[PDB]
Design an enzyme around this catalytic site. Structure first.
Site, short mmCIF file in Angstrom:
data_model
loop_
_atom_site.label_atom_id
_atom_site.label_comp_id
_atom_site.label_asym_id
_atom_site.label_seq_id
_atom_site.Cartn_x
_atom_site.Cartn_y
_atom_site.Cartn_z
N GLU A 73 0.05 5.76 -0.15
CA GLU A 73 -1.06 6.70 0.03
C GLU A 73 -1.61 7.23 -1.30
N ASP A 124 -2.75 13.21 -25.24
CA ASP A 124 -2.83 11.79 -24.91
C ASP A 124 -1.95 11.05 -25.91
OD1 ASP A 124 -3.42 9.14 -24.41
OD2 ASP A 124 -5.60 9.44 -24.36
N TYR A 149 0.84 -1.18 0.00
CA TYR A 149 0.00 0.00 0.00
C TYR A 149 0.88 1.24 0.00
CZ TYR A 149 -3.03 3.72 1.82
OH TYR A 149 -3.72 4.90 2.02
N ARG A 180 0.62 -2.29 -18.53
CA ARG A 180 -0.60 -1.50 -18.55
C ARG A 180 -0.62 -0.58 -17.33
NH1 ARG A 180 -4.32 -3.22 -22.35
NH2 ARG A 180 -3.49 -4.94 -23.62
#
Lengths: 450, 452, 450, 452
Positions: D62, D205, D60, D240
């Site tokens: 933040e 993009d 994990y 990905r």
């Protein structure tokens, strides 16, 4: 204890409020001693004013169209019903096909109630010179997604092709036709064709040409628009009031026997906009004006308005002035002052100092810095002026702009710099005196004549 | 050929439009011969009506506050300036701390222009009974994120804790005080405290009570609200017009020092942008007359009498056993609870109307549980407390017949209407109400011996 | 010419990227030599990781649920179908009543696709501690009208009455249950009752307790919610992936034989959120984890998770610590450190320096200044720790906070001032060594064992 | 009782899930034995895949850019820092002028987080083919006021005048360049000029071409765009993942002097707020490997070969008479116009798929007029120009059969499907395509003699 009722409530304005009585009287004379060419202005009848300034101002009503005709609403209901049917009559509408709501306070809240009725917030809108949301950013640009269509950059006519390109791309829920300051008629057929292709409602704001529309002196937007709104004091020559016409009954094919759902949506939206009820005195006055607008005398008035606008434009152009579209087909001319090296602010401010009132006006290409003036015929036509009288108005305009140029040369083009020339100026006082001398020659509606 | 200008434009309404002229006379007589208890209605002065039906109706103005004082605007700018200064005077506002825009068409466009000035679309708004059917779903609820605060469902007073509760959870950008049918004064201090704990602008729609505010007969929202809006035909006794007051000058003490209020320009622009074709300058002129009339000791005594008539009518009704919401009144209206009698507002409003008593059904499902009744109109006709007690008696007579048609001809809205036909009792009460109404003076027309 | 394929594409990470290989190896040991109590963390299986790090990462697919099973999609279609049916099985759903979309990238985009599917922009939303729109302002608070419901200020349980008050007043189109950091179960029945009364859809985000839900160790939101979303790496112990469950078939009465219209709306919304197709390796890994989650061994795991959370809370409270709601019924405890005179930042930073990872956490009353820590059992339960092991974790926490207090006393309460105490601190190194010594004693999933 | 940790958690997939394991093998074989022409697909390196299936999946974080470099974040912060610096290096960006956020889950959440950072709801957006059915109506069109700009309907190139036309009328707050199926380079200079005349932010993009941008084989959007976003699995050959680049430091010359870009904090917050439960740190690590591999001369030669393979495939197809949109290519894809042959994209895509040639139908009603074909995947397997010409021949064979099933078995989608059953010609072309595909290396697994 209280004052006696009469002392405050049955005494004349001259006794209660001498300051206001005096200024109203001064403004009364100013309207008479000047040339009013503001296109949205008119001079309405004494009969309208009497209905306007009457006890109808005291009558509350719910704000939905009156259907009771009994009780405390017995009389406003018939007044309003007379207003509705006179409305349908003056615009030559089939009541089985068209309904009219006559409760909005004014044209702008009438428009915005119409938009609120048929659209959701942020639904996309197109209208002529409609900002995307300083000039004027109405509620219509703020709460909806507005994209304008525009006149042809060179000819001043609406680019009906770029409009269709725009509509098919942008896909508005609603297209608004009938902008102001447009001096030609509207191809409402093409607007319907275009709206059909992009699945848009088609609304016309005929505020400016409602009088010409009524007299069948221009194209009728009712033939192709789903909704028509208007204010009633312009070419219609009535009170400052509003109305919303909407289609009723069967829809043209597209679909299994579907009927227009405008009436209830519009009624509720105006109702919801009417904190405290309508201005029932405005409805009473409007009914008066609608009856008047259905007279032969009004058909002729509307004809003379067009003819006065045309004659004024031809005069202005012969002196070498630039009119958008090079002419007019309705009640106004749009005068591009930039080729003269002038702004509309200077011409309007100098005119104004000469008892000519015109509106500075954006012309094709402006960026509050308007390079034009808007000029309307309805007000002075209502005082009975004919084509030769509007040719003399053209000459006054000629002199005015000739004077603006001369002041600008001696004092500069910057507005504040130009301003020093309007101080204690002989040619301004001379021109103003000629204007007052000319304007006093004509009659004036709006007060009692024995 | 054009009609001569005198024929269509200088000829009285009696000739040009006999049909409308007749209906206005008939309505004129109806206003004289009935008891007008609609809380928002008043009867304005002839002088207001003269300024209203005047050549100001032809004057175009751009819709920005006028400051030219020359040319074609020389006179309306002077009139407008008289309106603004008189607005400020009538509500006891320092001009260095308060500005006023007298240009909106009416109350509701005034409000929505004020909201458009200080808010953005979807901004959060709290107002009394403000919706998120029979009721108004207005532009304020549609383009903004709106949530009501309510009166305490058992006391009928504003539940100020439950309001601060919602305001701290909801975080409205704007809280609106003022209400169409609240019979009690507002705690504008408490609203300001709530506004500041949640970071809200505070706005008062004072339309119903502005006459009392001007007379200092109720609390002044100007002490605590950032903006005060009003329509002007209610207890202010003016034209149907609109007005937006806003704070100017330095702000009160987590903000920058030397900070100033920033309301004037945004409000002016928002009003200007809402005025396609200009304001109603005839309304601005008429309103300047009304504001002058409001600044007089005679008007102060009128406002005192309005409150006292409302109270006296209230004490009468509950003296007979009826239930008023909050059990009385502090302003110009009473709000009568008809549920303990088993009737709806729509029923009593209909029967009353048949007797030339005009009231409005009022919330207290979607079926109106009460009736709203106001003192300004009848007080304007000169009525004092015992007259309003006679109105109370007429209302007691009226509602007693409604309970007699209900408990007899049926309680359904179908079965009830069948009982109001050739009804002797409704005829005779109409007649008594008529006889009583004609006893009183009526403002709005010019006395014969002032015509000189 | 090109490099040979193997040189870049078939060589180990240790050869291609020694720096990254080394840090991954260092992070590998750090996970082993420490106490991970982050509630959203788990340690997934080697089998999941193999499906995750496979050639499925190369497979593009449209992003609508696979129905072909032939051609280039023959295999991802069966993989995804195995994922869907394992999903329905692990949560004990009737496939005629429940559908599952397993294409979202993660839980948050899965939520936002769900919201986009069933709501319009600005539609009103309620969820636990959902900001109105620094903490976290998700897309859900920005593009919808969010109002939170809140726990009881004193008891820490959801005020189900203030929630109903809120729902009936606010009228949300959708109510979200299943916030994080909530240590009790959810009364989904009351949520359904409340949603029925205000006409709201009822969505559950079970991201945190999906594992406990699967094992039927807590209430199932499927019994009363219209939609269930989740991420899959928390208590479910799978990949970092997302899923969206929606009702299918007949609606409960309210209505003339109307059926849920969720499937197509949700499919399109996820499809529209999937620029470049889904993470098909995540779908492959998720299917693995779902099969694993349906085992008896997982039912027992989930039981032990709850039991470890309970035992840890009882230990913490016996030392005088404040747990929100005073206990737990799921996988986590929420520890209110404010009564100690401590912030979550200090406790989390000191813990972190001792190889204990916890999340600082807002507790009822905070204003980024959190006064609590969130503590989860799933990660260390997956390493096989039982209740006594979590009691020792409680002691480590005790020592940690005891140390925080002592540092705060000697160096001050201001965070920067407190910070000087973490420098070259013997008690921090001692506690860390005890933690590493303790943590190394337990097994670790996620890599190959012979 | 709990299963031992080794039983469920340390046991290979072949044992824990034989069913999934089998299907992954089968798919593994399918990728080796076919021609992958999906323009967005690539084959990534085993080293990327190792960093991806690693214990970073349990970590994990933040969701804010990591700067601790101590405690539980000591290592991912170092990994993340390697990712950021390698992103900047691979696109030749000065760190004092460009920052990068490597935390979004994927391309589309990256985009929408970038839009959420710099825009407000309903802000006006322009992008290529961006909608306002078969196509994606995505969050960008739904929460923002979006309008497309299009290629010139006859040349297939971006109509730059018609784009500046719309941009000056529409006034988008943001213009987006980059497109899924554009076979030509972008004039980012012209976009910046358009952006500045209408006051827009400019965003690229670059997902499809980022590999080419890194190799400097197409124009760099970083010279003119304010923000560049990317997904990383296309021509960049990575995982990905998602990535947002933004300008930092002083702005270019009607603005304040000494002004600086204000993108970093808003983007960071928007990415953080979109990451419930943290980022995919296994994706950040894998991407750092991909960026390192992208910064090498071998990758530059791969990108050159991709372009040249696309061109060589293009020249082949039109050498046989087929129509490419814009009649060729400047990047990694060709866009084949099937309308002059009378077939739809869906038809050729289906038949191709039956022969282990994967392409995508593509716009050029709601019926796809063409087919999108990309070189990155096959070029990653070592194919050069003559191999892509063999692919061209396979595609010519493939489309010739499609025109033979259409003109015979019928042109309807009903009548057409009946012709793809036990079809000898489809069997033999599948077989030839299969035989050809197995000739080439495949990245993604560890060679036996690197296992040491």
């Amino acid at each position: 204890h209280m004052d006696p009722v009469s002392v405050w409530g049955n005494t004349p304005l001259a006794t209660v409020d001498p300051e206001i009585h005096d200024l109203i009287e001064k403004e009364k004379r100013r309207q008479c001693r000047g040339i009013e060419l503001i296109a949205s202005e008119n001079f309405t009848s004494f009969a309208v004013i009497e209905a306007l300034g009457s006890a109808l101002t005291n009558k509350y009503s719910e704000g939905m169209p009156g259907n009771r005709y009994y009780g405390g609403n017995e009389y406003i209901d018939q007044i309003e019903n007379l207003c509705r049917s006179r409305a349908l009559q003056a615009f030559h509408l089939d009541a089985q096909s068209w309904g009219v709501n006559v409760q909005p306070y004014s044209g702008s809240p009438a428009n915005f109630a119409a938009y609120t009725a048929v659209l959701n917030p942020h639904d996309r809108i197109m209208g002529l010179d409609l900002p995307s949301g300083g000039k004027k950013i109405s509620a219509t640009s703020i709460y909806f997604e507005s994209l304008p269509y525009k006149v042809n950059s060179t000819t001043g006519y609406i680019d009906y092709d770029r409009l269709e390109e725009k509509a098919l791309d942008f896909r508005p829920k609603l297209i608004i036709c009938g902008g102001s300051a447009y001096p030609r008629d509207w191809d409402y057929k093409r607007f319907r064709e275009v709206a059909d292709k992009c699945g848009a409602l088609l609304l016309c704001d005929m505020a400016h040409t409602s009088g010409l529309v009524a007299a069948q002196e221009v194209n009728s937007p009712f033939e192709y628009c789903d909704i028509v709104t208007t204010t009633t004091h312009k070419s219609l020559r009535g009170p400052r009031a509003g109305m919303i016409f909407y289609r009723k009954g069967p829809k043209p094919p597209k679909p299994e026997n579907a009927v227009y759902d405008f009436e209830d949506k519009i009624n509720f939206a105006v109702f919801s906009s009417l904190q405290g009820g309508p201005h029932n005195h405005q409805i009473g006055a409007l009914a008066v004006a609608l009856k008047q607008a259905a007279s032969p005398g009004f058909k002729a008035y509307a004809k003379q308005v067009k003819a006065n606008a045309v004659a004024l434009g031809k005069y202005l152009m012969g002196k070498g002035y630039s009119l958008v579209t090079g002419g007019t087909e309705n009640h106004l001319v749009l005068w591009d002052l930039r080729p003269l090296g002038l702004t509309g602010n200077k011409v309007e401010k100098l005119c104004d100092l000469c008892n000519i009132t015109v509106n500075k006006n954006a012309v094709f290409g402006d960026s509050l810095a308007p390079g034009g003036v808007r000029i309307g015929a309805p007000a002075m036509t209502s005082r009975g002026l004919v084509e030769k009288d509007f040719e003399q108005i053209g000459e006054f305009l000629h002199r005015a702009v000739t004077l603006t140029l001369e002041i600008q040369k001696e004092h500069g083009k910057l507005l504040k710099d130009f301003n020093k020339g309007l101080v204690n100026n002989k040619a301004i006082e001379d021109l103003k005196a000629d204007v007052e001398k000319f304007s006093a020659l004509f009659d004036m509606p709006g007060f009692l004549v024995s």
